[PDB]
Amino acid sequence: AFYVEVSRSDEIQKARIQLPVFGEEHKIMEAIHHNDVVIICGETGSGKTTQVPQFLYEAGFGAEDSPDYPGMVGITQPRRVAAVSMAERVANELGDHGHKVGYQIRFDSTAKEDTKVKFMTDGVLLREMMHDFKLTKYSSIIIDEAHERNINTDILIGMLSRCVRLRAKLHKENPIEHKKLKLIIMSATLRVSDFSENKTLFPIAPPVLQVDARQFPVSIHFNRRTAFNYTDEAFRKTCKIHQKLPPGAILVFLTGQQEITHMVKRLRKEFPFKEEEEGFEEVLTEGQTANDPLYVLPLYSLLPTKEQMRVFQKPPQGSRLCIVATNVAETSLTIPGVRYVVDSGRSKERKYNESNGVQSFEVGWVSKASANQRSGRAGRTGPGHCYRLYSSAVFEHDFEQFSKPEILRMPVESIVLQMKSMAIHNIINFPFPTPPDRVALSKAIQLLQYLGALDNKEMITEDGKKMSLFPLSPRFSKMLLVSDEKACLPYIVAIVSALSVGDPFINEFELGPELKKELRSKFYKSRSQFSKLDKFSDVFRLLSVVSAMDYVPKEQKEIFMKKNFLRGKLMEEIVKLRKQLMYIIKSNTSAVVIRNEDLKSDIPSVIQIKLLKQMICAGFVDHVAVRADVLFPDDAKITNRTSIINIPYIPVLATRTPNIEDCFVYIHPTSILNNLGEMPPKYMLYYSLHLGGNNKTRMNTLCDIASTPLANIARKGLLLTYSKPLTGQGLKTVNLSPTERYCYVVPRFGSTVDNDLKIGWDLNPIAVHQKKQKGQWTVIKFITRKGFQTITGEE
Numbered sequence: 001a002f003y004v005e006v007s008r009s010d011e012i013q014k015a016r017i018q019l020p021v022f023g024e025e026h027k028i029m030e031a032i033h034h035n036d037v038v039i040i041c042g043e044t045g046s047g048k049t050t051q052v053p054q055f056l057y058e059a060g061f062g063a064e065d066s067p068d069y070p071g072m073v074g075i076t077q078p079r080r081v082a083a084v085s086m087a088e089r090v091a092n093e094l095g096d097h098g099h100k101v102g103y104q105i106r107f108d109s110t111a112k113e114d115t116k117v118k119f120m121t122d123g124v125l126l127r128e129m130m131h132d133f134k135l136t137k138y139s140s141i142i143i144d145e146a147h148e149r150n151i152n153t154d155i156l157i158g159m160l161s162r163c164v165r166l167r168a169k170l171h172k173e174n175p176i177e178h179k180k181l182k183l184i185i186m187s188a189t190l191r192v193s194d195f196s197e198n199k200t201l202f203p204i205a206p207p208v209l210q211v212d213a214r215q216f217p218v219s220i221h222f223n224r225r226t227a228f229n230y231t232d233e234a235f236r237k238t239c240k241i242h243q244k245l246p247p248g249a250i251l252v253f254l255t256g257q258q259e260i261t262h263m264v265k266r267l268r269k270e271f272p273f274k275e276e277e278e279g280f281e282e283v284l285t286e287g288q289t290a291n292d293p294l295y296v297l298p299l300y301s302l303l304p305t306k307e308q309m310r311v312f313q314k315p316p317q318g319s320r321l322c323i324v325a326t327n328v329a330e331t332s333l334t335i336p337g338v339r340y341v342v343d344s345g346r347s348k349e350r351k352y353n354e355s356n357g358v359q360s361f362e363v364g365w366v367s368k369a370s371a372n373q374r375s376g377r378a379g380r381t382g383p384g385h386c387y388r389l390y391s392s393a394v395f396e397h398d399f400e401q402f403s404k405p406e407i408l409r410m411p412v413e414s415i416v417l418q419m420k421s422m423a424i425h426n427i428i429n430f431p432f433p434t435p436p437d438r439v440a441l442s443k444a445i446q447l448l449q450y451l452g453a454l455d456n457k458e459m460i461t462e463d464g465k466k467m468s469l470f471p472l473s474p475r476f477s478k479m480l481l482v483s484d485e486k487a488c489l490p491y492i493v494a495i496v497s498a499l500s501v502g503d504p505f506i507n508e509f510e511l512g513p514e515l516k517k518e519l520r521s522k523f524y525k526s527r528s529q530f531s532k533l534d535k536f537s538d539v540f541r542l543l544s545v546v547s548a549m550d551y552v553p554k555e556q557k558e559i560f561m562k563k564n565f566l567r568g569k570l571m572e573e574i575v576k577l578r579k580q581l582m583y584i585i586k587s588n589t590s591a592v593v594i595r596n597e598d599l600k601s602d603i604p605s606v607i608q609i610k611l612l613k614q615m616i617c618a619g620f621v622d623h624v625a626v627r628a629d630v631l632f633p634d635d636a637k638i639t640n641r642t643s644i645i646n647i648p649y650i651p652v653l654a655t656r657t658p659n660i661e662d663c664f665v666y667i668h669p670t671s672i673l674n675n676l677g678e679m680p681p682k683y684m685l686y687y688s689l690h691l692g693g694n695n696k697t698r699m700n701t702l703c704d705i706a707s708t709p710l711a712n713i714a715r716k717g718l719l720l721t722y723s724k725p726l727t728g729q730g731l732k733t734v735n736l737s738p739t740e741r742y743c744y745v746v747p748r749f750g751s752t753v754d755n756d757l758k759i760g761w762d763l764n765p766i767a768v769h770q771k772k773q774k775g776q777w778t779v780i781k782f783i784t785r786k787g788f789q790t791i792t793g794e795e
């Protein structure tokens with residue numbers, strides 16, 4: 001009721017007083033009492049994850065005798081293992097009340113009667129809000145690890161902002177029947193402005209509580225210049241610190257495991273056991289040399305627990321601890337005695353942009369906020385130093401102020417489909433902590449209707465639910481749904497994995513003197529080995545290389561990448577994704593274990609590659625470009641002599657301008673299409689459009705598509721209108737009743753002749769089966785020339 005008396009052992013209680021959050025109990029509880037929403041900032045090691053549910057439990061949260069907080073305390077974690085290990089920790093810590101702690105890591109499981117403090121995943125809470133949005137079961141909700149900005153955590157916070165508001169309104173109407181809901185958002189960092197200062201999320205700003213003790217100052221040292229070889233500059237800087245500066249451990253921030261492993265051994269080999277620069281004014285203390293040993297250790301998420309745990313050990317006497325890490329060391333447990341940070345200023349992050357034609361997983365500059373978080377790592381135990389391996393001008397102009405959340409680095413239609421499967425109806429006005437653009441949101445809902453994932457009322461369909469089962473862009477999930485025809489499924493999973501991961505082919509990002517011409521000969525010979533399936537499709541060049549990979553032995557892999565100018569990491573990743581999709585497909589046809597041998601396939605037949613282009617079309621129906629001379633010959637200025645990269649194309653649904661040349665897109669010089677001795681295809685399917693270096697928009701081409709296959713896909717994809725029945729020789733309308741007919745129509749793809757400020761075009765005349773439904777003729781199916789001839793013969 002008022003308070004709950006918990007009995008803990010002296011060992012357990014003394015361990016709790018040591019935690020930085022322990023003394024913050026009264027400030028935290030004063031904020032919760034006066035505010036329905038509270039934001040708590042404290043690093044990992046502060047104890048806020050394990051202590052705040054206990055502070056609530058002790059104040060009467062979850063107590064049946066409580067007139068205010070009878071409901072449970074719910075705590076989300078972004079990972080299943082974190083929720084279980086956290087529940088285990090708090091159960092021990094709560095002593096004689098330890099039986100009141102539980103976890104939920106499945107939707108299936110029903111909680112135990114004594115569970116009053118429940119640790120779960122975001123997914124479990126999201127599912128619970130589908131069954132009961134009000135979450136009447138809870139008195140409180142703690143959203144931990146909110147600085148990660150995971151897409152489902154952001155949706156959950158958005159949903160909860162509305163839930164807390166409604167719980168507040170119902171409580172004001174009837175405090176007996178309706179209880180308050182306490183929302184606590186937790187962050188390892190101070191970067192909470194997208195939660196605290198967002199008025200759509202929180203109209204009245206919630207208090208932000210700082211639980212950490214104050215840090216020590218850190219002197220920031222920029223380099224005069226920004227070195228291209230940053231691992232070389234990082235190695236150089238690390239050695240200079242070790243050889244010249246007083247005691248204190250070193251922390252190096254690199255981008256990945258291979259850079260780490262290479263530097264770790266380069267440093268171990270440099271300091272083994274038995275002009276003018278900033279930040280080198282300090283000298284070595286007595287009993288310290290320039291050639292002392294360096295105890296080097298790697299630090300990355302993939303390392304085994306026993307290897308990760310070594311970063312906390314004191315280095316051997318007479319040596320210096322040097323940690324070589326990725327951004328895991330940005331918000332991890334405090335590595336003791338660090339007074340030197342070597343910052344490369346970069347990280348490998350997945351980027352994706354709308355209207356910009358961006359899709360990358362690569363090394364780029366980090367935000368100013370991440371650079372500062374890296375810097376502050378040197379001032380945890382005492383005043384430290386940070387060595388930035390870039391200039392202050394590059395920092396100021398090339399580093400963005402803030403790090404981009406996941407919701408802005410992932411396809412907008414993936415976010416919309418995920419929300420729609422959760423029965424979140426109004427997307428346009430959803431209170432996102434960081435909202436995607438309204439135009440992009442509107443475009444994502446329309447795309448989903450073209451893919452059949454949402455119906456005419458914008459509700460999730462049966463196909464949309466199946467597509468939501470894959471960790472893929474709905475374009476790719478659509479392709480999978482239509483692929484199980486004439487055994488094309490293994491080919492589509494291969495294409496979809498390759499397109500999803502990125503382009504493994506290295507192009508003339510190298511040489512396009514005598515040695516340069518010699519390498520182009522090997523380049524083109526390699527490129528032509530994967531161009532054998534179709535002469536128009538860059539997508540089957542991907543299928544060929546991915547299919548070749550499966551027949552290459554593990555030892556020979558590296559030379560296979562070298563001979564063929566291939567991104568090895570990308571090829572390994574495609575094999576990983578194909579196995580993950582194969583696991584999902586097989587697991588939905590009822591334990592499943594996919595091996596490298598299950599991925600091996602034979603060459604697709606002529607019928608199969610025709611069908612695959614149509615399956616690609618289903619996922620990319622709004623991404624068709626017509627050869628400009630079929631629409632605007634005078635403006636196109638295409639001769640039989642024009643080069644392939646100079647022949648313009650017009651994307652369907654492109655917005656018209658006074659000058660049609662504004663709508664022109666062109667074949668990329670790296671495309672298979674450049675080897676054509678003929679006029680390129682009338683209709684081309686494209687992955688994406690890129691605003692090129694020569695100021696020309698270039699198509700990232702997939703494959704060609706013929707008129708009738710495009711018509712079939714555009715009919716199901718709702719991008720077709722038809723003309724009135726055609727009149728002509730052997731074209732005559734055959735009426736089965738005044739409500740049923742078979743006739744020839746001209747299909748209109750995309751946009752009508754009348755609506756000429758958006759690009760559309762006519763397809764080849766086609767035989768059609770039509771039924772007069774609600775006073776208007778509707779196309780039931782397309783008919784072949786032979787099919788039509790038999791119907792005209794039957795009548």
Ligand SMILES: [Cl-]
Pocket residue numbers: 101102103104
């Ligand atoms: Cl449990």
Ligand SMILES: [Cl-]
Pocket residue numbers: 354408412435436437440
């Ligand atoms: Cl956006």
Ligand SMILES: [Cl-]
Pocket residue numbers: 538539542687700701702
């Ligand atoms: Cl492609």
Ligand SMILES: [Cl-]
Pocket residue numbers: 538668670671699700701
């Ligand atoms: Cl291309």
Ligand SMILES: [Mg+2]
Pocket residue numbers: 445446449
């Ligand atoms: Mg619509």
